[PDB]
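## tool: complex_structure
## caller: assistant
## args:
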Amino acid sequence: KRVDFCGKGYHLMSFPQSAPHGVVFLHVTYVPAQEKNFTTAPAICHDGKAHFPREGVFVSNGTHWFVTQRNFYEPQIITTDNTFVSGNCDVVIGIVNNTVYDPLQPELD
Amino acid sequence: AGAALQIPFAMQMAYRFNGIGVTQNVLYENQKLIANQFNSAIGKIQDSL
Ligand SMILES: *[C@@H]1O[C@H](CO)[C@@H](O[C@@H]2O[C@H](CO)[C@@H](O)[C@H](O)[C@H]2NC(C)=O)[C@H](O)[C@H]1NC(C)=O
Ligand SMILES: *[C@@H]1O[C@H](CO)[C@@H](O[C@@H]2O[C@H](CO)[C@@H](O)[C@H](O)[C@H]2NC(C)=O)[C@H](O)[C@H]1NC(C)=O
Ligand SMILES: *[C@@H]1O[C@H](CO)[C@@H](O[C@@H]2O[C@H](CO)[C@@H](O)[C@H](O)[C@H]2NC(C)=O)[C@H](O)[C@H]1NC(C)=O
Ligand SMILES: *[C@@H]1O[C@H](CO)[C@@H](O[C@@H]2O[C@H](CO)[C@@H](O)[C@H](O)[C@H]2NC(C)=O)[C@H](O)[C@H]1NC(C)=O
Ligand SMILES: *[C@@H]1O[C@H](CO)[C@@H](O)[C@H](O)[C@H]1NC(C)=O
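## result:
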């Protein structure tokens, strides 16, 4: 996890080869590509409660809000298993209104 | 690690709080105090210099 100790990018793995009086390291790394821009927010307010992502960031495609993982764009809908709650929505700078979906009660019809 | 991708600075500070074991609500609920403390700490360096 040391930055730039094993090449440029996120180190995946490395292979050694012998040279005359030396060694050659072939570093395999992961390099992110083809980014898009989005709107973002730190928390989400629902029922007077602030919701934070467990892992990921809240992003908006223009009209809807999703959670994604931070390094590869893979959007999902914001549920109570995606997030955790802390406090009320009066203290966070930049909080946004949206609905956080519960699975249990629409299972219970 | 590649191309520069923008992110707002308080959200970068929250990632970094996660990287030491503190949840990020602890940053967002203290943002103003944390920024005051950083500013006083930076203002103390030029005084010693
Ligand atoms: C943002 O993504 C959503 C996808 O959830 C698009 O909204 C539509 O949402 C309904 C119900 O959620 C789906 O049945 C549709 O298939 C979605 N797409 C369309 C084209 O109707 C929404 O269009 C996206 N917004 C932008 C600006 O890209
Ligand atoms: C990001 O910065 C913009 C300014 O560029 C902020 O927008 C202003 O919001 C205030 C309310 O606090 C309004 O009174 C101003 O009229 C807005 N200005 C513009 C140019 O839109 C925005 O609130 C900031 N975002 C956050 C999360 O603080
Ligand atoms: C997000 O939703 C909340 C919930 O209603 C909004 O809070 C209201 O804000 C208006 C204007 O600031 C007040 O007149 C109401 O009294 C508030 N309602 C409650 C129940 O407190 C909040 O304004 C919404 N945020 C945005 C940006 O529209
Ligand atoms: C955590 O520590 C900080 C000290 O940096 C406290 O904030 C200070 O509180 C004193 C009260 O004695 C104020 O006079 C200062 O102005 C505060 N500093 C800043 C930068 O706001 C804070 O109260 C402490 N929190 C708790 C829960 O004890
Ligand atoms: C994102 O938008 C900015 C302008 O706000 C633009 O300069 C940048 O090239 C865009 N990047 C992508 C991936 O769309």
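## assistant note: Chain A touches chain B through 22 residues (CB under 8 Å). Residues 48 and 90 of chain A are 9 Å apart (CA to CA). Handing back to user.
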